[PDB]
Amino acid sequence: NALKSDFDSLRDQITKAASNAKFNGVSIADGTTTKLSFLANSDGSAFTVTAKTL
Amino acid sequence: NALKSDFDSLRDQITKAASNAKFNGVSIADGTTTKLSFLANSDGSAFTVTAKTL
C-alpha cells in the first residue's frame, strides 16, 4: 500500500503538470483542442501543428 | 516496577517530542488539524498534505 500511495501521488502530479502547461491561455498538449493553426504565409495559409495530448 | 517506570518515562518523552514538532506556529504531525495546504500554481489550486498524527 505504500507503493500504491507513491504511484497515486505520481499519477496525479502528472495531471497537475499537464494541466498547467499553456501559453496565453491555449495549449498544444492539454488535449483541449486537436490542433493550432499558426500563420505560414502572407495569403493566409496556415502552419498546422497537430496537438499531442499529455 | 523499574521496567514499567522506564516505560512511562519513554511514553512521556514521546508526548514531549510529538508536541514540540512545530514550524512558524503550524504542524503537520501534532494532530491539531486534519490537513495542511500549499499553493500549486498561479490560479490558487492547492497541494494538500494530509496530516499524520504522531
Cell numbers for B3, please give them: 521496567
Q: Give the three-state DSSP class for B50.
A: strand
Please name the residue of chain B whose CA is at the shortest distance from the CA of residue A19: B41
Rounded CA separation A11/B26 (Å): 28
CA count, 13 A, side-chain hemisphere, A27 = 14
Which residues in chain A are contacts of B40 at CB distance < 8 A? 16, 20
Is residue A8 within 8 Å of residue A16, measured between CB atoms?
no
Q: B25: closest CA among B14, B40, B36, B39?
A: B36
Experimental approach: cryo-EM
Is residue A3 within 8 Å of residue A11, measured between CB atoms?
no
Which residues in chain A are contacts of B45 at CB distance < 8 A? 16
CA count, 13 A, side-chain hemisphere, A45 = 4
Rounded CA separation B33/B23 (Å): 14
Is residue A41 within 8 Å of residue A48, measured between CB atoms?
no
Rounded CA separation A44/A35 (Å): 17
Handedness of CA A6, A11, A15, A20 (dihedral sign): positive
Rounded CA separation A50/B35 (Å): 42
Is residue B50 within 8 Å of residue B28, measured between CB atoms?
no
B46 interfaces chain A, CB cutoff of 8 Å: no
* Shortest CA gap B31–chain A (Å): 21
* Shortest CA gap B30–chain A (Å): 22
Q: B52: closest CA among A8, B35, B38, B43?
A: B35
Rounded CA separation A6/A14 (Å): 13
A2 interfaces chain B, CB cutoff of 8 Å: no
Cell numbers for A1, please give them: 500500500
- Phi then psi for residue A36, to 5 deg, are -125, 140
